[PDB]
Curated annotation (Swiss-Prot), chain C:
Quaternary structure annotation from Swiss-Prot or TrEMBL: Heterododecamer (2C3:3R2) of six catalytic PyrB chains organized as two trimers (C3), and six regulatory PyrI chains organized as three dimers (R2).
Binding positions for L-aspartate per the UniProt entry: R156
Enzyme Commission number: 2.1.3.2
Species annotation: Yersinia pestis
UniProt keyword Transferase present: yes
Keywords assigned by UniProt, alphabetized: Pyrimidine biosynthesis, Transferase
Record SUPFAM superfamilies: Aspartate/ornithine carbamoyltransferase (SSF53671)
Family assignment from sequence similarity: Belongs to the aspartate/ornithine carbamoyltransferase superfamily. ATCase family.
Pathway annotation: Pyrimidine metabolism; UMP biosynthesis via de novo pathway; (S)-dihydroorotate from bicarbonate: step 2/3
Keyword Transcription attributed: no
Pfam families, per the entry: OTCace (PF00185), OTCace_N (PF02729)
Protein name, per record: Aspartate carbamoyltransferase catalytic subunit
Sequence positions that bind carbamoyl phosphate: R53, T54, R96, Q126, L237, P238
Amino acid sequence: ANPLYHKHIISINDLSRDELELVLRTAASLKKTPQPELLKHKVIASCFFEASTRTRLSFETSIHRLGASVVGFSDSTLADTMSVISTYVDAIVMRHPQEGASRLAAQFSGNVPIVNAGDGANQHPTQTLLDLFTIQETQGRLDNINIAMVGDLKYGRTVHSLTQALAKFNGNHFFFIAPDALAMPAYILQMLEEKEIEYSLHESLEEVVPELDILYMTRQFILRSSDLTGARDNLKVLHPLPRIDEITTDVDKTPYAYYFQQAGNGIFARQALLALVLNAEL
Amino acid sequence: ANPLYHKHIISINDLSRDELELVLRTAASLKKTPQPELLKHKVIASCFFEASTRTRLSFETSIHRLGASVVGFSDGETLADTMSVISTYVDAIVMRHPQEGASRLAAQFSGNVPIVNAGDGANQHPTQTLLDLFTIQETQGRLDNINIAMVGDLKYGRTVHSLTQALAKFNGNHFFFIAPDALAMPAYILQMLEEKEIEYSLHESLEEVVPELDILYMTRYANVKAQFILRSSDLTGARDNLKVLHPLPRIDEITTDVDKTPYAYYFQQAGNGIFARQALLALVLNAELA
Amino acid sequence: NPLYHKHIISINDLSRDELELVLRTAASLKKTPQPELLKHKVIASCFFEASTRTRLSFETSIHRLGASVVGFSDSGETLADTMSVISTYVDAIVMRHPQEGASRLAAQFSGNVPIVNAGDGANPTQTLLDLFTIQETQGRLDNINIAMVGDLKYGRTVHSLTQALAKFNGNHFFFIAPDALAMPAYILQMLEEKEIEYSLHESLEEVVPELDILYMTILRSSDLTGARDNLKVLHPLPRIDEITTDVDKTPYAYYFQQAGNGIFARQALLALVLNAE
């Protein structure tokens, strides 16, 4: 069996480097050549105790694209609830407001795997996976990358996980651009230091745009098209979404915008995971 | 190569008479011979930004009847941005929004992922008009030479206006407008009818014209309800072919005793939404349709 | 088949023969699934009142037969007009509504589209799941010794299951409930008229050795010390304190399997309603 078979996917950290690369190869394959019947006859529950239209739609589309059916709730004793649901369905995609809830479901779901679509505000494994997949797709690699992370690096959910994931690769250089009150926390700088991974701090984008392979904008530090003069041809601008004012609309039609394509990649990342946890061979 | 392939469907007034007849011929064909695998392997987003259960269920049913999957929501970020993301996911988008205009939204997207307007901020609801048209055509055999009355609020319901505009692309139609003064069909509609030399007349009551009607279209205050409600007694002296239509819901405009008459066709009309909406989805997503 | 295009308003309206057909069908679908039986069918799931467990079970059942689902999970136009419209869209309607008699009202306006009642007002298809489970495990629905424990007064679950089992032969009911929560006199009257044996008790041990089935609605594993080998403990759920978690460990534990059996019992109902054979 592939190593993820009937494995609960709760945290991105619970995947080894080998496991990430597997998911990513699988996602690339599915994007290139769809398998509309891979999960035929499977029924997957979409349990969004917490509403999250964007993530739910992505997961449901992923499930349908693999030929499986979806039953669920789009908004709201868990132990027993999951002990019952798990008697009906082949997998459970869960989103819940309290961190630890997905793991709890997992303690009771038996051989039915739980795929976490978000557990509290920080743990979002498929967001990290789609971020990684997008960097891989656009740059051809996850090593030797110049990546900037801009905005709120203190309460930025997706950005801590992303940094930790990329830190497992070789030769990356992180450029952290944030207000002092919202700097990337110390424990993250600490691990980068201990892994001998290069990072640098800058007051703004202007000065480092020429160096970047990826500009990751978090939810003055607003990005506008004018700021992208001198960019590398391979530069991609990412944002986990939604954006409000941090990326002006004029960026959208430059060759560097890739936030919508990045969201679109969520389908492949999520299909790959569903495929791997439900099919022993692949 | 069909003219609606990879085209957004936003306002019914954007379709020519030829395009309207294509949609209707396609709807009639799907009513007679379903094609449950036509959109096999397609995923269609059902994006309802306000609850609109009847219209949403009709669209989702239509999608399934063609063999496609449905993803959606049945009830901040710009709408453009929401659709930019969803457009990367799905093959087509059904969109209902109580505030935003479907026209502005659609102008920003190519029709490679067609957007079908299920009702927007400007009150454009093209598939309501299509199903009304299909219902007149299938019960009367034609969309020309129809005597049609529109009764109730003719000022503020856009769907009665769009139906009038669409019917005015055909010949020999006679419109009977029955409304209180405060709710008169607008002058912008009457001027168009005169320009085209389309006959219309105003009446204070339904009872004056029932005998000559082919279609009685009832629209969706104490005085107004009081004297414009339709009862089965009102239908004595009617043509055999008369059909009573209503976009729904009817609360008080049509008494339940009309439901058993041979003329009641508002539920069948609603059922015709399935074929009109299937036809549209079929046409925007398939170049060739045989 | 006798349930073809019939409305299923009440499991209690079904005869012994019809119950047995639903149960044979259920057993057949559990053993050998028919994932395309209802291919190209569209079924409405109209949950006016939310009931997540029941709705998910019905929707899963629908997808397991290859049919599509449209509907709503919760939610002035008459119910009559709403159903007059929905019945023009779909092939069958599963509905749950807070008004007593809603599904029967709906059935008056749905033409030839069958209505399956998932619960009107004071509510249940739970009785089918219960029957199927007893049959599956006990190999029969006749000569069964069954104990119902808890609140027998307001427990419409036990009422409908008692009514259902009373359609079978030689069943023996052991009613265990607080004095004030007694199985109502009108139910006992029905058993007495049918010459169906029942007995009243104050406690659950002391009867365990005689049971084929123990139906809960205060148990512990210690209580089933001298249980019969074929015994099964059942509970419709959602449980709270009635059954302890150490009973989940026991080998007579069958409430989750019972719950999982909803899929087959509900698929069976829908298959029979929508297919001649």
